[PDB]
């Protein structure tokens, strides 16, 4: 199916002394492959997946250079944005940046993205066509004029449409044993009674990859959203994900309810029902 490569970066200022805390993470789909933490002892981009360990010194040197450059740009930015917003030197502020590319089943470029935020709010982002920018306020508009004059969009577009895609294909090929493998959810239903007239049915999906999944309930073959609770998809910690969906039902009527599970690893969606 589809794939993506995305990098996330977070810089938090330390106004009383020193440089900001900078954490960078890179993903292929739902798999973390590299990380950089300014508080770590290596001061190097580090591997987080076995398939990236085969890259040589040249690659690690390159990634470390580029990531340090990203941290210094955020360092400067924190000061520049502090001024744009007339803020004092006493508080801690955050800059977040996320960029990457999506590809289709054929591995060809689908779309690219580059978003930047200040204190958790939109700041500036590249538009879908990758040729212009969306600035949320007048400070971000000052950045947009800088970026237009320095032709930043052109540079990014070339990276997003080309380089990003090329590296994503290299990674999918090198990590094929896991990256190109889909792990279907292991499903089961549990039952719980709170009183003599009400019961809860919980449909579980475990050990799946990728994270995208759809869990839905039906009553007599009709979709049912009322009286349902769906938890956020969560990581199991071994690279797979979990999620559950519950429906509250009149005790004794459990057999009318069915859980439906949709996932890339299932050649056909599955249905679960509670037996007596």
């Amino acid at each position: 199916g589809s794939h993506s490569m995305r990098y996330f970066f977070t810089s938090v200022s330390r106004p009383g002394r020193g440089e900001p805390r900078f954490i960078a993470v890179g993903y292929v789909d739902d798999t973390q492959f590299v990380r950089f933490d300014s508080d770590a002892a290596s001061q190097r981009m580090e591997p987080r997946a076995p398939w990236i360990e085969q890259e040589g010194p040249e690659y690690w040197d390159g990634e470390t250079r580029k990531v340090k450059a990203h941290s210094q740009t955020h360092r400067v930015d924190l000061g520049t944005l502090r001024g744009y917003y007339n803020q004092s030197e006493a508080g801690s502020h955050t800059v977040q940046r996320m960029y990457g590319c999506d590809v289709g089943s054929d591995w060809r470029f689908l779309r690219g993205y580059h978003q930047y935020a200040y204190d958790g709010k939109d700041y500036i982002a590249l538009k879908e066509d990758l040729r212009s920018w969306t600035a949320a306020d007048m400070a971000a508009q000052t950045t947009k004029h800088k970026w237009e004059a320095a032709h930043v969009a052109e540079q990014l577009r070339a990276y997003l449409e080309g380089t990003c895609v090329e590296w994503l294909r290299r990674y999918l090929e090198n990590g094929k044993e896991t990256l190109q493998r889909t792990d279907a959810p292991k499903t089961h239903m549990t039952h719980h009674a709170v009183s003599d007239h009400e019961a809860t049915l919980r449909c579980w999906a475990l050990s799946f990859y990728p994270a995208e999944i759809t869990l839905t309930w039906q009553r007599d073959g009709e979709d049912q959203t009322q009286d349902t609770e769906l938890v956020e998809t969560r990581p199991a910690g071994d690279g797979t994900f979990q999620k559950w969906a519950a429906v509250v039902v009149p005790s004794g009527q459990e057999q009318r309810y069915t859980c439906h599970v949709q996932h890339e690893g299932l050649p056909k969606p599955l249905t679960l029902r509670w037996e007596p």
Binding site: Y7, K66, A69, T73, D77, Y159, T163
Partner: peptide
């Protein structure tokens, strides 16, 4: 691989 060589300052 990351975007390079050096992200433009805001």
């Amino acid at each position: 691989a990351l975007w390079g060589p050096d992200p433009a300052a805001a």
